[PDB]
From a paper:
In tetrapod vertebrates, Krüppel‐associated box zinc‐finger proteins ([name]‐ZFPs) and [name]‐associated protein 1 ([name], also known as TRIM28 or TIF1β) are key repressors of TEs (Rowe et al, 2010; Helleboid et al, 2019). Once bound to DNA (all but a few), [name]‐ZFPs recruit corepressor [name] via the conserved [name] domain (Friedman et al, 1996; Kim et al, 1996; Moosmann et al, 1996; Helleboid et al, 2019; Tycko et al, 2020). At its target DNA loci, [name] functions as a recruitment platform for repressive chromatin‐modifying enzymes including histone H3K9 methyltransferase SETDB1, heterochromatin protein HP1, and the nucleosome remodeling and deacetylase (NuRD) complex (Schultz et al, 2001, 2002). Here, we report the crystal structure of the [name] tripartite motif (TRIM) in complex with the [name] domain from a human [name]‐ZFP, [name].
The crystal quality was improved by deleting the flexible B‐box 1 domain of [name] and adding the CUE1 domain from the chromatin remodeler SMARCAD1, which binds to the coiled‐coil domain of [name] (Ding et al, 2018; Lim et al, 2019), to the complex. The resulting crystals allowed collection of X‐ray diffraction data extending to 2.8 Å resolution. The structure contains one [name] RBCC dimer, two SMARCAD1 CUE1 domains, and one [name] [name] domain in the crystallographic asymmetric unit. Consistent with previous biochemical studies (Stoll et al, 2019), a single [name] domain binds the [name] RBCC dimer, near the twofold axis, in the central region of the coiled‐coil domain. Contacts with [name] are exclusively mediated by the [name]‐A box (residues 3–44 of [name]), while the [name]‐B box (residues 45–71) is disordered and not visible in the electron density map. The [name]‐A box backbone is U‐shaped and contains three α‐helical segments: a single helical turn at the N‐terminus (α1, residues 6–9), a short central helix (α2, residues 15–20) and a longer C‐terminal helix (α3, residues 23–43). Our structure of [name] [name] bound to [name] reveals that the interaction is mostly hydrophobic in nature, with a buried surface area of 1,108 Å2. The [name]‐binding surface of the [name] domain is enriched in exposed hydrophobic amino acids and recognizes a hydrophobic patch in the central region of the [name] coiled‐coil domain. Mutation of the highly conserved Asp8 and Val9 residues in the [name]‐A box results in loss of silencing; both residues form direct contacts with [name] in the [name]‐[name] structure, with Val9 buried in the hydrophobic core and Asp8 forming a salt bridge with Arg304 of [name]. The RBCC domain of [name] in contrast displays no significant conformational changes in response to [name] binding.
Author numbering:
A (entry chain B): 16 to 225, 243 to 478
B (entry chain A): 19 to 223, 244 to 266, 277 to 481
C (entry chain D): 4 to 45
D (entry chain S): 1 to 47
E (entry chain C): 2 to 47
The structure:
Amino acid sequence: SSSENLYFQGNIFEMLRIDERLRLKIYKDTEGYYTIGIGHLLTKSPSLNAAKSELDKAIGRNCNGVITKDEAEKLFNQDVDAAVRGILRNAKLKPVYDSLDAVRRCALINMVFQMGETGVAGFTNSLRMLQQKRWDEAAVNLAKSIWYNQTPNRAKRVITTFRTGTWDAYAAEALELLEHCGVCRERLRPEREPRLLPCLHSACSACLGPGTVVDCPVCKQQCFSKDIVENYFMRDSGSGERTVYCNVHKHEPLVLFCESCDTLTCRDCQLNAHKDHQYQFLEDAVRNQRKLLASLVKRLGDKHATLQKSTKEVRSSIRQVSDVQKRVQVDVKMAILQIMKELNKRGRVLVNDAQKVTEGQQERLERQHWTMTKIQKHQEHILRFASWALESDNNTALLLSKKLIYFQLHRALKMIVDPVEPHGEMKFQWDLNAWTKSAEAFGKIV
Amino acid sequence: ENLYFQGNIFEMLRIDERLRLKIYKDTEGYYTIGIGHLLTKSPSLNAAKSELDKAIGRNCNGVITKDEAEKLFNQDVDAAVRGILRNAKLKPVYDSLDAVRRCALINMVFQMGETGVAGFTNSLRMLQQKRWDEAAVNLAKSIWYNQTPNRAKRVITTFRTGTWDAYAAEALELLEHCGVCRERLRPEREPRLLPCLHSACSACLTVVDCPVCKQQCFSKDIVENYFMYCNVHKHEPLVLFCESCDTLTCRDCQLNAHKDHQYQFLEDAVRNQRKLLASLVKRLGDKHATLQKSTKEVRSSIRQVSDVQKRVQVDVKMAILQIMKELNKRGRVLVNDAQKVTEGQQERLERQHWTMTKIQKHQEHILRFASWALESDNNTALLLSKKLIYFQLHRALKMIVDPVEPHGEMKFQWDLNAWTKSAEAFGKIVAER
Amino acid sequence: LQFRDVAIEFSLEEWHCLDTAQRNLYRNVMLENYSNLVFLGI
Amino acid sequence: LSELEDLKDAKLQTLKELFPQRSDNDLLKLIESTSTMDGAIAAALLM
Amino acid sequence: SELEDLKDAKLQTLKELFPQRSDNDLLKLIESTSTMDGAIAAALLM
Ligand SMILES: [Zn+2]
Ligand SMILES: [Zn+2]
Ligand SMILES: [Zn+2]
Ligand SMILES: [Zn+2]
Ligand SMILES: [Zn+2]
Ligand SMILES: [Zn+2]
Ligand SMILES: [Zn+2]
Ligand SMILES: [Zn+2]
């Protein structure tokens, strides 16, 4: 990409490894808090032992003040995961995070990792600017903060990432770090006796442990200690280029490059120890050596570009298989809902079939109950009256109206009431087991 | 003795609430219409009319029909029952009561509202504990009772006993009152008896329709309700039965108008007619007794037919829910099968991403170091570092990165037409005689 | 037999995979399953 | 004999009680056009 | 050497992925698998 000599594995974990040096012993940060590993806070109260206790607790081990790198890495991944969840559950950070590209999302996670979701939610005007792009403007507003004044070097890197959406600030620091000890980050001045391991990581001689073998503190790749050489580029950083002298002929400078052995030699070794194999004088050999190496770099950069494309293809495949799963979950649920719909349609039909029968019989029985009730009312009216008329001592009135009463008594006695006719019954019938087994064995999943 | 009634809530309320087809003010000055239907407590008659129009669905200048009144009546009766059921203090009581006493509770709520009745805390408690005589005495002290005592006494007697005797007794009493205005039929009302043994103030009446029954008679057939003396001679009693003309007559009319037709003395006509009527009444009472039982049967058949319909609706709905449960049981399995496949594919893809990422980190480490070494002016350091740098450059160039595999897609498969046809043919309703 | 047994729910990720007819079909059934359970009482 | 005239009368009086504002003419027609009492009543209910 | 160079390429790839496994264990995984991805998956299991 923008590769003057700028390369960067652009993700949140690599981003944070640059911002936070690994400390396998409890240390006090610049606000006096006890922290360990990769930017992990143990305790805020300035306790002598709360820090050790929280260390033992977080690890699950009796940690006097020391964890292993594996333990540090476990804490680190947990802490990154925590920062991300904090963004997602936070009403102010989440909509911003969603709007951002992956580079800028990492810049936002970085802030949360360092300060907490509440502190980052506090940068309201900056968060708004970012959700609206306004990248240059967000960069300026963020540089006005306390964060910036307290940790300007990190803030400048994070702000550049928000502004440009590139990883250049981190590629640049990764490059700067070639000149610093892989372990303690001290600049590799000659006083540090800088050493270059075969895996091209380098360190203060004091930062390496145990012919014999040494495990690289960066990347863990093992080598023989006899194969560790001086980091001659940094060894000379305190003076400029120095003649190097033979390990054996200690007064003779190395002035020849032995192509057959691919290393520098002094005159006495080239004439004696290395007799009959090929060499040039140093300043003659160097031009072709620079061309060979630069050519390999061109080839490796091409392979790198291919791998970057291949990795992007893999991420897309990942999103695809995830989406196939969602497709299947939806297809399954919709298939069942579709069946449920037809079952409810049949349900309504079965009920309407039963209702057709019931309405017929009820129309009849209700008609008859209506008849019986209304005839009964007449009967009670006549009986109530006829008894009242006879309860009366007024024989004149009784005889004067006997005609009207007599008629209604006979009329009620002629009333026709057809008898209560019986009714059929009906029952719902179905095969529970056949349907259960058609469920259970419904479909697949090809 | 001669107590007949048709014991249900609707006939109960008809005894207690005279039908009104025009808006009127009740005893609290509230506007009411129909069968005890309160329109509004608002003092504005126009508010009453607006509520009436709202209730009926048309512009009623304060007037409704009997059918409209009946519709409100049934709505209000149903409303009283819902009020009882949704109320924590009334439902336990109602549930504990028999059908007759339940009608008494509905009667009260119909009249006063569920919260008014709920206010009768101790009387309600007594009723649920079946302390009937205590409940009667306590309810009899209420504002209700003092405000509508005859109604309250009928409702209270209904609570005391399990019967409708109070309502049978009021129906008997009502024979002495006008069929439409319910005023007592004293002679000043010119009370008249129609051939269908309904009576009315002459004021409320060749041909006339009965206010109560809707049945016709010739006005010539309508007589004074004589239960509440000669129509020709102003000082004469009727003392003879003109058997020839089937009517009572006085001395002067039998002597002149009906000279020597044929007659019996009133005392002769009295004893005989009372023996005849008494037997017709016993016969009708027996026909009535039979009809009461045949009606209990039709009611049982109606409930049974209804219960069968509910049974089928339940069996169908439950049968379907049970199948639905099994479909979702399967749905969960189908998804889980798919998820196993997805997890497998994602395990691979992430392994491959991890590999490519880690190899890339190496490539960038070597590219960065070698480039830095070449920017340097320190040719001695470069030549001393050449063996190590070259080695890592070639080693990075050899590294093997397998390409991503095509990983095929999985699909959900099922037979939609087969399932629609199985559902269309699902279940059967079987009839038996 | 309570509602969960016949209920179907869509996640947000799934919800946005549903078109108009699918969202309505879902309503038809879920509304109707509810009514059948209200009637039945469980 | 005149049994059907006594039956017709009994059926008519039953209908007049059930349908108080129908003419005897309409009520007799539906009695004559049906077979049972319930039949006649059902016919009368259709107005 | 036709396939020996490929075996060494696979070895160096594994060594970068699993820095503290011996060359003999990594070669055994290469011998027992058919692909690079296979050897890696088996290595992650160990
Ligand atoms: Zn290393
Ligand atoms: Zn160091
Ligand atoms: Zn040599
Ligand atoms: Zn030498
Ligand atoms: Zn009157
Ligand atoms: Zn009448
Ligand atoms: Zn006279
Ligand atoms: Zn006479």
